[PDB]
Amino acid sequence: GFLSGKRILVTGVASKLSIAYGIAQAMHREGAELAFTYQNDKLKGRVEEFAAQLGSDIVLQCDVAEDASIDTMFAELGKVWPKFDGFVHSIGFAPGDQLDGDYVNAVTREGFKIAHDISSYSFVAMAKACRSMLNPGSALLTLSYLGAERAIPNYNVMGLAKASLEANVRYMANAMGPEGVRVNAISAGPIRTLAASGIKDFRKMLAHCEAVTPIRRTVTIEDVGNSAAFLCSDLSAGISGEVVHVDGGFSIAAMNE
Amino acid sequence: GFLSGKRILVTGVASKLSIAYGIAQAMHREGAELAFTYQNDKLKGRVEEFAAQLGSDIVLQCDVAEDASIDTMFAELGKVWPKFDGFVHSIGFAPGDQLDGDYVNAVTREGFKIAHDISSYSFVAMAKACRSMLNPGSALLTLSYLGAERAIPNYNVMGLAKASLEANVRYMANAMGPEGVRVNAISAGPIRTLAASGIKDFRKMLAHCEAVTPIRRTVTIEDVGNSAAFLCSDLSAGISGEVVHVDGGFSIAAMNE
Amino acid sequence: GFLSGKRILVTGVASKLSIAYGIAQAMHREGAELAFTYQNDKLKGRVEEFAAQLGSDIVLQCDVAEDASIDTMFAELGKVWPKFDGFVHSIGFAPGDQLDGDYVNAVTREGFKIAHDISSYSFVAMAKACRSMLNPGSALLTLSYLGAERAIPNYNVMGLAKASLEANVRYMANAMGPEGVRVNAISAGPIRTLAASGIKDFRKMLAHCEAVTPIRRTVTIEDVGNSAAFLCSDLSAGISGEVVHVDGGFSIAAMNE
Amino acid sequence: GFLSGKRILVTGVASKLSIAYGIAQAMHREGAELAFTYQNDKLKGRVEEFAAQLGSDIVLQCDVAEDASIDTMFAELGKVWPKFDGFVHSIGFAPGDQLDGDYVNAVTREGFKIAHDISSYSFVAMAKACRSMLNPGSALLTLSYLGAERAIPNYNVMGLAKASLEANVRYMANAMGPEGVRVNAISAGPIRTLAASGIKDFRKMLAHCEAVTPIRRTVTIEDVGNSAAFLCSDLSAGISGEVVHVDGGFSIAAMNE
Ligand SMILES: NC(=O)c1ccc[n+]([C@@H]2O[C@H](COP(=O)([O-])OP(=O)(O)OC[C@H]3O[C@@H](n4cnc5c(N)ncnc54)[C@H](O)[C@@H]3O)[C@@H](O)[C@H]2O)c1
Ligand SMILES: NC(=O)c1ccc[n+]([C@@H]2O[C@H](COP(=O)([O-])OP(=O)(O)OC[C@H]3O[C@@H](n4cnc5c(N)ncnc54)[C@H](O)[C@@H]3O)[C@@H](O)[C@H]2O)c1
Ligand SMILES: NC(=O)c1ccc[n+]([C@@H]2O[C@H](COP(=O)([O-])OP(=O)(O)OC[C@H]3O[C@@H](n4cnc5c(N)ncnc54)[C@H](O)[C@@H]3O)[C@@H](O)[C@H]2O)c1
Ligand SMILES: NC(=O)c1ccc[n+]([C@@H]2O[C@H](COP(=O)([O-])OP(=O)(O)OC[C@H]3O[C@@H](n4cnc5c(N)ncnc54)[C@H](O)[C@@H]3O)[C@@H](O)[C@H]2O)c1
Ligand SMILES: Cc1ccc(Cn2cnc(-c3cccs3)c2)cc1
Ligand SMILES: Cc1ccc(Cn2cnc(-c3cccs3)c2)cc1
Ligand SMILES: Cc1ccc(Cn2cnc(-c3cccs3)c2)cc1
Ligand SMILES: Cc1ccc(Cn2cnc(-c3cccs3)c2)cc1
């Protein structure tokens, strides 16, 4: 496929509903060789199962909150992939209290710190740690949400973390471009995944979106997966520092009441 | 390839340097069945030659300035493609006097009229005329330039025509989405094509861009072609109403002096 | 006031509800010397009355559809105001048929032509015609709508006209800046004026906005009037080429129910 | 003046060059009653002097890094100003090592942490702490930089901090709007202040901008001061959640040589 010969690292797989799952499948469909990472013991065997379904057996632990974890992960990957062609960063976090209700009243200094560190810093942290191992022609992908551009009720500090993330896409795209590395983001529409629970009135949101979205349907991880496969293939060599909205046109329309 | 089974109409092929040429090749590479249109007698045989190189023999005349031309073209296409899956609109025009020097002093009411009619209206005009012939899952693609978003010296009224074009992408994406049609645009970086002559200090521009562009190189029609192939394939079903910048990151950086 | 000693030309006063009326009141309050134009005889006397109230007896006719009309109006204005400090462009138009329903089915070549000529070009037409009469430190102002940036139902081709006008603002600003002229636009929230009748379900829209606008209320021509007076005074010297949104925050929020 | 009867809290006055100084002068001129804070003792006396000149003797200490510091400062302020009308957040910070060179190599976890806490969170921290002391019709203001939207060399992690801060503005605005509070930011062009020394080749940058900025000159703290005074007065009632660029048009133009 259009990814044949590419060795890509996919983070964030937690379940079959995971966006990183849809991406991994698609990337695997187009012929990329995948490696995976899991956050903790809770997820290890699951990811190991999915990795094996995708012909991969490179499943390493990684908690983006620990510089040492990252470093150690990239050290284990090297042993088998001395050089690779990028990675998908499908990670994100904010303490529970954070995404519920009035942003000003919900936000706290420590939640703000955690939301940013895990959701925005982690991206560069990982690039930082594997810079040397990247082959020219490499692509780094990340996922964001409209909440970075607009104020979405309950999204709260995550909006700020995403804004921070998108800017991180630009600065990393500018600094790494000279050595063959592109860096982009997909601003996906809401999808029903593990992240759904945490957010207030989700199932209600997904119904409103479907009715007001140009394509009249919410996007699927399949959809996202295909756009991610493309963004990590040479087919997109002219795109770098870009936040591609894969939301069925939701963001460009207004008052589709 | 990822376009196999798609019947796409490609407008704008004038020469091997043409952006629509790079797109046609790529689309042909991924297995789409192409049909072409030519503006006048001057271009007919050329396009006919390229069409034949791409296994196509559907070469129809079309001058987007004539509603009747458009209608007649779509009538001839129907005879062979009763239903198709979209079209690439690689057309654009502005009288010579228009793109030279001080915008305020250069712009005139008639140049403004022509620049918009050909560069922005034509897009919807064509969708208008083939709406019925479009298969659900159809994608319409158009090409724009950064001049729509920023003020570029000498680009002058074309900036306004492009702004108009991009907005046209949104409104058409919103109205057609409900019936299976997506509409997008590629905001490409400057490429040396027939359009180069018309613009002041081009070769100088292309050198400045290469030095300040994240990927440190200007994009190629190959680059654009691949992004267009993707935007017209089901791989991008989640993207609609989007202006994807295929400019190597030029637009997201600043003062890369 | 902050406009003391400024002679500003106010276009578009049609009624006491008109955005041009609110802006005139405001600049008048702030100490600017005003001059007004009217489209035709049907509005001659009225505008003459309003001008009177605002202490002005410079009420010149002007139909922006005629370069000749513009040229002659600036001729008459010169007789009294050899040099002035800017003008407010509060004109917009699109044939009735264009504004209701499916954009793709409503939009027609002439409609698109008329929409962009009156709503977008006229702004520069006027700049062209008085460029030499403008004092250093002048400011030109125009009114846009979020329809330029997003796809709003029924706004149809007017969305493209405004997108084109907003880009007109950036080109004009970059062109005239070096000679002491700033050009800006105000993207106003929906207001109840003569534009009310001609747009499908306005009342429903003005109730939705209020509900969802951060300031929980639609803006008033007073509100816009004050941002307008500020954008044409030296208080906004550092601002040019900008589209300041005066919509109570409407556009920055998303899914506020 | 247009700020008569407003009690505004001005943060960040470090020197006569400080953007906070220009803004204070401006609001003072317009008739607002001011209160000031200083980061530490090194700046106690100075700020006390400036405040004096501006007819104010409310000079409270505040280190935005301590929720405790903020809480106590609003305690003291309450004693005299039980209810006030807004505050100017003119604070920014990132450890020296973060700002020079390749962003990817310069950025470090703590740097990123410190950058976002001081430059982005503090804005909301302060809102949180005085939310109940704010009068209806209040306005909060912050200063951003184009670095949030584009990738500027050496701005590095500060680009992400500002991106995060700009999104803070939209969330805060959507949250506090319903209670009579507007929140806006000013994206100012480069100015010569205490931020000058710490950024690589500032002088070269301030000469480039002047050359390429539509108004052909860098903005002054006076310029910003006036946009600031306007954004915190009732003249901007219809404006909230907005990032008004006060950069002489710099960001709207492209390739102006
Ligand atoms: N699904 C949606 O509706 C949606 C929409 C738009 C954007 N997003 C974004 O897509 C990404 C993936 O979300 P999803 O819906 O697939 O979520 P998911 O809940 O399935 O997985 C999130 C991943 O985050 C990982 N993670 C959290 N902390 C980590 C850390 N400390 N170290 C390593 N891994 C860590 C988890 O292991 C998890 O697998 C996020 O950036 C999210 O914001 C999701
Ligand atoms: N090449 C560049 O540097 C560049 C960069 C960005 C955007 N663009 C855009 O890409 C498109 C294609 O440009 P290109 O560089 O490949 O140009 P090109 O000069 O090779 O071809 C332009 C096409 O416009 C067509 N055209 C003009 N008037 C027409 C009409 N009346 N009816 C039918 N066809 C008509 C011509 O036949 C021509 O083939 C345009 O929209 C252009 O703005 C070009
Ligand atoms: N009403 C709103 O909520 C809204 C929202 C955002 C922006 N605006 C814009 O502000 C502007 C002011 O419109 P308005 O709502 O004040 O309504 P209005 O009916 O008062 O003003 C529109 C003006 O354009 C004038 N005009 C039209 N064609 C003319 C021509 N050929 N030459 C000269 N004058 C002509 C009309 O006489 C009229 O005075 C419009 O451009 C509108 O798009 C309106
Ligand atoms: N100088 C420019 O051209 C530029 C451009 C755009 C925006 N801005 C922004 O405007 C703001 C004002 O900066 P400035 O240029 O006026 O320089 P400055 O040196 O006058 O002000 C920065 C202020 O932040 C204060 N500060 C930092 N950490 C503190 C903390 N822990 N708690 C409380 N106060 C602390 C500093 O004392 C100082 O007064 C900054 O946020 C800056 O990013 C500056
Ligand atoms: C608690 C938590 C778990 C997982 C996430 C990931 N996430 C980020 N954004 C989102 C959402 C986008 C749309 C609706 S929820 C989810 C965020 C918070
Ligand atoms: C005269 C003319 C011929 C062809 C075009 C097409 N065109 C549109 N934009 C461009 C350019 C983008 C970058 C540099 S020139 C070319 C425009 C004008
Ligand atoms: C048919 C027509 C005539 C005049 C206008 C002027 N106009 C521009 N924008 C608007 C409106 C925006 C929001 C509500 S009305 C009105 C628009 C359409
Ligand atoms: C190290 C550091 C300390 C303080 C700042 C404050 N700051 C923010 N933005 C700026 C500047 C933008 C343009 C020129 S200086 C300075 C930035 C970096």
For chain A, domains (ranges, CATH) are: 1-257 (3.40.50.720)
From the CA of B24, the nearest ligand is 2
Distance CA A119, CA A99 (A): 14
CB atoms B151 and D204 under 8 Å: no
Tell me the pairing of strands A84-89 and B7-10. unpaired
The shortest CB-CB distance from B208 to any of D147, D205, D255 is to D255
Distance CA A161, CA D120 (A): 11
At A67, which amino acid appears? D
Strand partners, A252: none
As a dihedral over the C-alpha atoms of residue C85, residue C86, residue C88, residue C93, rounded to 10 degrees, the angle is: 150
The shortest CB-CB distance from B242 to any of A213, A220, A245 is to A245
- Kindly report the backbone phi and psi dihedral angles of residue C164, in degrees, each rounded to the nearest multiple of 5, phi listed first: -60, -45
CB atoms D238 and C216 under 8 Å: no
Distance CA A63, CA A44 (A): 12
Distance CA C255, CA B92 (A): 37
Contact D186, D230 (CB under 8 A): no
Establish whether residue A147 lines the binding site of ligand 1, counting it when its CB lies within 6 angstroms of any ligand atom. no
CB atoms B215 and A247 under 8 Å: no
DSSP D199: S
DSSP-based three-state secondary structure for C34: strand
Nearest to D143 by CA among D232, D62, D206, D214: D232
Could you tell me if residue B9 is left (phi over 0), alpha (psi between -120 and 50 degrees) or otherwise beta? beta
**Rounded to a whole number, what is the largest CA-CA distance in chain A?**
55
Q: Is C231 annotated as a binding residue?
A: no
Distance CA D207, CA A219 (A): 47
From the CA of B21, the nearest ligand is 2
Distance CA C26, CA C5 (A): 15
Q: Is C19 annotated as a binding residue?
A: yes
Q: Where are the extended beta strands (E) located within C153-248?
A: 181-188, 243-246
- Kindly report the backbone phi and psi dihedral angles of residue A249, in degrees, each rounded to the nearest multiple of 5, phi listed first: 85, 5
Strand partners, D142: D89, D185
Active-site amino acid positions of D: 145, 155
DSSP-based three-state secondary structure for C66: coil
Residues 6+ positions from B72 with CB-CB distance below 8 Å: none
Contact D226, D214 (CB under 8 A): no
Distance CA D98, CA D156 (A): 7
DSSP C253: B
From the CA of A254, the nearest ligand is 7
Residues of A with CB under 8 A from a CB of D: 67, 102-105, 107, 109, 112-113, 116-117, 120-121, 124-125, 127-128, 131, 148-151, 153, 155-157, 159-164, 166-168, 170-176, 241
Contact C142, C164 (CB under 8 A): no
Residue to mutate among B171, B252, B257, with most A CBs inside 10 A, is B252
Nearest CA distance, D106 vs chain C (angstrom): 33
Residues 6+ positions from C209 with CB-CB distance below 8 Å: C189, C190, C218, C248, C250
CB atoms A148 and D167 under 8 Å: yes
Strand partners, D90: none
Q: Is B29 exposed, middle or buried (0-12, 13-18, 19+ CB in 10 A)?
A: middle
Token pair 């184009």 is found at D146
Provide residues with CB under 6 Å of ligand 7.
C 92-94, 96, 99, 145, 158, 190, 195, 198-199, 202
Closest ligand 3 atom to the C-alpha of C190? 3
Contact C184, C236 (CB under 8 A): yes
As a dihedral over the C-alpha atoms of residue A173, residue A177, residue A180, residue A183, rounded to 10 degrees, the angle is: 10
Q: What was the structure determination method? A: X-ray
Strand partners, D9: D35, D87
Distance CA A85, CA A130 (A): 10
At C123, which amino acid appears? F
> What resolution (Å)?
2.8
Distance CA C78, CA C64 (A): 18
Token pair 């962009």 is found at C116
Establish whether residue A22 lines the binding site of ligand 1, counting it when its CB lies within 6 angstroms of any ligand atom. no
Nearest CA distance, C50 vs chain B (angstrom): 31
Residue to mutate among D209, D255, D257, with most B CBs inside 10 A, is D255
Angle of helix C157-176 versus helix B157-176 axis, rounded to 10: 160
With CA atoms as reference, the chain B residue closest to A179 would be B215
CB atoms C104 and B125 under 8 Å: no
DSSP per residue over B81-129, as a string? -SSEEEEEE------GGGGSS-HHHH--HHHHHHHHIIIIIHHHHHHHH
Using CB atoms, which chains have 3+ pairs under 8 A with C?
A, B, D
Establish whether residue D148 lines the binding site of ligand 4, counting it when its CB lies within 6 angstroms of any ligand atom. no
Q: Which helix (H) or strand (E) holds A202?
A: helix A202-212
Distance CA C88, CA C77 (A): 15
Distance CA B223, CA B211 (A): 18
Strand partners, A38: A61
**Number of CB atoms found within 10 A of residue A92's CB:** 22
Q: Measured at the alpha carbon of residue D226, what is the angle toward residues D221 and D230, in degrees to the nearest 5?
A: 145
Number of helices and strands (H, E) in chain B?
A: 10, 7
DSSP-based three-state secondary structure for D86: strand
- Kindly report the backbone phi and psi dihedral angles of residue C138, in degrees, each rounded to the nearest multiple of 5, phi listed first: -75, 165
Q: What is the sign, positive or negative, of the torsion defined by CA atoms of A223, A227, A232, A235?
A: positive
Token pair 């990675």 is found at A87
b/e A136-163 (16+ beta carbons within 10 angstroms → b): eebbbbbbbbbbbbbbbbbbbbbbbbbb
Distance CA C89, CA D209 (A): 29
Residues of D with CB under 8 A from a CB of A: 67, 102-105, 107, 109, 112-113, 116-117, 120-121, 124-125, 127-128, 131, 148-151, 153, 156-157, 159-168, 170-176, 241
Contact A108, A167 (CB under 8 A): no
Q: Is A123 exposed, middle or buried (0-12, 13-18, 19+ CB in 10 A)?
A: buried
Token pair 């499916």 is found at C102
Q: Measured at the alpha carbon of residue D230, what is the angle toward residues D228 and D231, in degrees to the nearest 5?
A: 65
b/e A165-180 (16+ beta carbons within 10 angstroms → b): bbbbbbbbbbbbbeeb
Alpha helix stretches (DSSP H) within A54-156: 67-78, 103-106, 109-116, 122-130
DSSP-based three-state secondary structure for D133: coil
Token pair 């403004």 is found at B112
Q: Is A83 annotated as a binding residue?
A: no
Closest ligand 4 atom to the C-alpha of D43? 37
Distance CA D95, CA B251 (A): 28
Nearest to C221 by CA among C196, C252, C184: C196
Token pair 């509903």 is found at A17
